[PDB]
Design an enzyme around this catalytic site. Sequence first.
Site, short mmCIF file in Angstrom:
data_model
loop_
_atom_site.label_atom_id
_atom_site.label_comp_id
_atom_site.label_asym_id
_atom_site.label_seq_id
_atom_site.Cartn_x
_atom_site.Cartn_y
_atom_site.Cartn_z
N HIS A 90 0.02 11.76 7.83
CA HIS A 90 1.41 12.13 8.01
C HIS A 90 2.06 12.37 6.64
CE1 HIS A 90 5.61 11.98 9.31
NE2 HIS A 90 5.81 11.06 8.34
N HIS A 137 6.51 8.15 -0.09
CA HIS A 137 7.66 7.71 0.76
C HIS A 137 7.32 6.64 1.80
CE1 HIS A 137 6.10 10.08 4.13
NE2 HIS A 137 7.05 9.54 4.88
N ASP A 138 6.05 6.29 2.00
CA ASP A 138 5.66 5.30 3.04
C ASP A 138 4.70 4.31 2.40
OD1 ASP A 138 6.59 5.93 5.66
OD2 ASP A 138 4.58 6.19 6.42
N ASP A 148 11.06 14.67 5.20
CA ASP A 148 10.71 13.55 6.07
C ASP A 148 11.36 13.70 7.44
OD1 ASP A 148 9.72 11.05 6.94
OD2 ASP A 148 10.93 9.85 5.50
N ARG A 162 -6.93 -23.41 -1.36
CA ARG A 162 -7.72 -22.40 -0.67
C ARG A 162 -6.93 -21.19 -0.22
NH1 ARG A 162 -10.11 -26.81 -1.15
NH2 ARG A 162 -12.39 -26.83 -1.36
#
EC number: 3.1.5.1
Lengths: 477, 475
Positions: free
Chosen positions: A67, A115-116, A266, A415
């Site tokens: 995308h 952008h993502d 977008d 841990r």
Amino acid sequence: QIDFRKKINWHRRYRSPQGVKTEHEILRIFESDRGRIINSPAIRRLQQKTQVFPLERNAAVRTRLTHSMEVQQVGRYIAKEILSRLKELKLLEAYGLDELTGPFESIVEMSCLMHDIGNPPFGHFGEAAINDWFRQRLHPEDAESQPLTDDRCSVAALRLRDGEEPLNELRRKIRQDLCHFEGNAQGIRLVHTLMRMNLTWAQVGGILKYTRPAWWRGETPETHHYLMKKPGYYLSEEAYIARLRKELNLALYSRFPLTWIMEAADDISYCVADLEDAVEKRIFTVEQLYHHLHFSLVVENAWEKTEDQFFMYLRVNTLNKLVPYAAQRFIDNLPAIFAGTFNHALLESDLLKLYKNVAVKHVFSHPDVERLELQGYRVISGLLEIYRPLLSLSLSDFTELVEKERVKRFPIESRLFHKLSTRHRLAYVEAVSKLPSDSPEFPLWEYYYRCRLLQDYISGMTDLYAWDEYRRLMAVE
Amino acid sequence: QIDFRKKINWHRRYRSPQGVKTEHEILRIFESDRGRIINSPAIRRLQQKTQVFPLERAAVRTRLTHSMEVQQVGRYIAKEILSRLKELKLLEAYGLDELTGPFESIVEMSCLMHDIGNPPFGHFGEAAINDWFRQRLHPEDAERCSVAALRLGEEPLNELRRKIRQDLCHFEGNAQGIRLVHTLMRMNLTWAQVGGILKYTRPAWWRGETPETHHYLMKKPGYYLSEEAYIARLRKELNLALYSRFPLTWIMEAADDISYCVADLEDAVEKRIFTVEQLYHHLHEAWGSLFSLVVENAWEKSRDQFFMYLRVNTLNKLVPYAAQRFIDNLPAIFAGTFNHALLEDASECSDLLKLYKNVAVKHVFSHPDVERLELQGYRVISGLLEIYRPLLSLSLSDFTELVEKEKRFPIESRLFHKLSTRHRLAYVEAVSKLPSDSPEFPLWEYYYRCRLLQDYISGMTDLYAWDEYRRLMAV
Ligand SMILES: Nc1nc2c(ncn2[C@@H]2O[C@H](COP(=O)(O)OP(=O)(O)OP(=O)(O)O)[C@@H](O)[C@H]2O)c(=O)[nH]1
Ligand SMILES: Nc1nc2c(ncn2[C@@H]2O[C@H](COP(=O)(O)OP(=O)(O)OP(=O)(O)O)[C@@H](O)[C@H]2O)c(=O)[nH]1
Ligand SMILES: [Mn+2]
Ligand SMILES: [Mn+2]
């Protein structure tokens, strides 16, 4: 006056290029940025993060990467149009863009790809889970007023001390900022503090889509109501953004001129992709879809010109109408857009709203899609609860843990502390080291950075890795 | 004589743009191609196909992420060729002054689409297909074949048999890519865009020893017997001589050559096959020279920082060299007759890449996990082919009957429906064109029926092919 030489800043934060540079010299600076981003693991991680539909073995489906790749194309087309129009208008030389022609389209392209980048595993439901979990630990609702006696916040250091302190303002900021995780802000954190990409100021400017500080508590000013829609940066990045603003000659809460393009790109890409995937996943037929959409120029026209051919020509038609409009809008409002004060988007449109409506009514409403949103929230919520013991620790104890990596009093905490990626752990050390220990606000800052450490780890996970880690640590794998 | 207006052809095969177009008008044509390719399922399928290491739950490169990185190298090379040409004042002289953008765009998309035709388990998927088809119709004999129609008293019809037998045993991702962009995906790209993805000029059916003049360009098969006519038009449209290459392909090739291993050594350190230190040592083992200048220099900066600066140094030395090689040999490269790559053997530059290849061969590609996947892949594709063998076992009349009324063949029918409509259509479309009365009609039909199967299999993603194997094996 409009001079893009002032906005397209080719300097870097660390080990910066200096001096007088040729048009070609500046070009190579911006081309180096491209290489950094494209060869970045943060970008490769996107093929494992999901767009709408879960990742299948029949996965002709779009991921966050495919995308983002398609958005990059829209952004390129818009920037290329803005420049072709500016050239026809004889304004290219007048606006200083004559030599910065390439960097202009390159910045837009890379801002689209990135952008993502900071979106967490499970997107809107990963965001949801983080904020909701942190909200229930340190209640930010309580810090808006005067120090309340029943301050619900579990963190002893962050509880507002009773009319005693201006130090309470840091508590307010820390409490709100930690409950306001946003992919956009995480992206800035990630490109700067975490990935240590050392991009150009102009390149970083392009990925600052919102100007609201995460810690913001009030109602955004009417003047910048839109730009401050969502949080754009965290309390940790406050100083970075403050330099970025200086370097890009941006007013307070003003946006970088080129961001309006990435945003518009977008906006166009938003649904059309997902309707194509809904037909692929067989939620409906191309025919069934044509019916729900039921303008003539874009949708009808594409139907006449089966599966791939309809979407190929729906995309084309949509772009050929919207791309010039966005380009025109940008040039038309260039004064405000340049100042970074423009309080609207380039497409503020009905054709896109139509695609949104059909996708909402028949795709994002799908039981499969809504059952991953439920599951995703459970996973991230669970994951956070698994690492809760690290945040439960006292400053002295946690410090001791960071120092002699393996502590015997805390086997489980040790841990779990090792499970956290070295990149994030380093950022914690680096940040906490900078603070003055003698300071009364030092424990407040440490807790903030410790929480940020955990948020960074979780958001950094791929959809699949987060799911696995949940099942492994739940002792079911 | 060198005029890029003649090579950068913005026309399409079907419903073509015509006339005189503005610099901007031509730009939008090439930008439409970008959109077609980027939003193509053939490209989305790449994130499910593997580059070296198996797909894990993540920082590893897939065919898509690698193709994306090649695209960047290609852009850099094209951008350099143009910056140099501009400095030389040759840009206007070569017709590139207005086609400046399409030039770098064609290179970029040809880079993304190199790897599009590659079958599920890469060179092992190729292996499996060719070996399976070789054991059915023995092409060794036409210079044992089970296909009664394709067995060679006399006849010039025998030459079609020779061509069909060799072509079907010469599956190649490069050729499949051309088949895929044209016949299967029906993308309707520009002639110039298609030209960029024709990396080799050897017809698959070729049996002889390639001519010395084009020995290099004809290295591997570039197109099938089915695409013979298409390529013939592409050659006409791009003013290409017979067995000549598109000028810009030399750039995509050079970009591909650079990207080859460096990526996979970075992934080997990630997958923890060795440490950055261990690697620095093996590179030293294999060799103020280019070596000190690129590898040593990058190690000093570090002791991700090592790979960031290895990439940078490599590119900063190789990209200008490739750009220069291209300009220097532009007459031959333009004609499409140039019988070398931009980075050829002799060069100190070529030797740096050969070093990366050697380290990766000795320590990365030789990895048991890598090799296990290769063995497994071969088993899957080999199995899959054997599952659909009943469709090729059918007589022409029977198979035709099956294509028509989509009862006597329950298994064959059901298997025939499994085949993607896109490939099945292409069979119908191709077989429909042939004259039924012709004695070569059964030969052509079998060819297209085999091609139908090869198209389906190669079209599968690594994972889908594995699943389909296990599903159809009743497990
Ligand atoms: N599953 C699902 N996906 C959605 C829904 N709404 C939108 N989407 C998809 O998810 C994304 C949501 O878009 P945004 O909210 O803008 O995400 P974003 O762009 O990172 O957020 P901003 O940057 O703040 O605009 C879109 O790209 C859509 O493809 C929904 O209700 N469910
Ligand atoms: N698993 C595995 N991968 C390999 C091996 N050798 C190379 N590779 C990978 O395969 C990629 C492509 O190798 P090639 O087959 O020579 O090239 P191509 O891209 O398919 O194209 P052509 O050479 O034109 O056919 C390399 O970049 C490596 O990532 C090997 O022995 N095993
Ligand atoms: Mn998006
Ligand atoms: Mn390759």
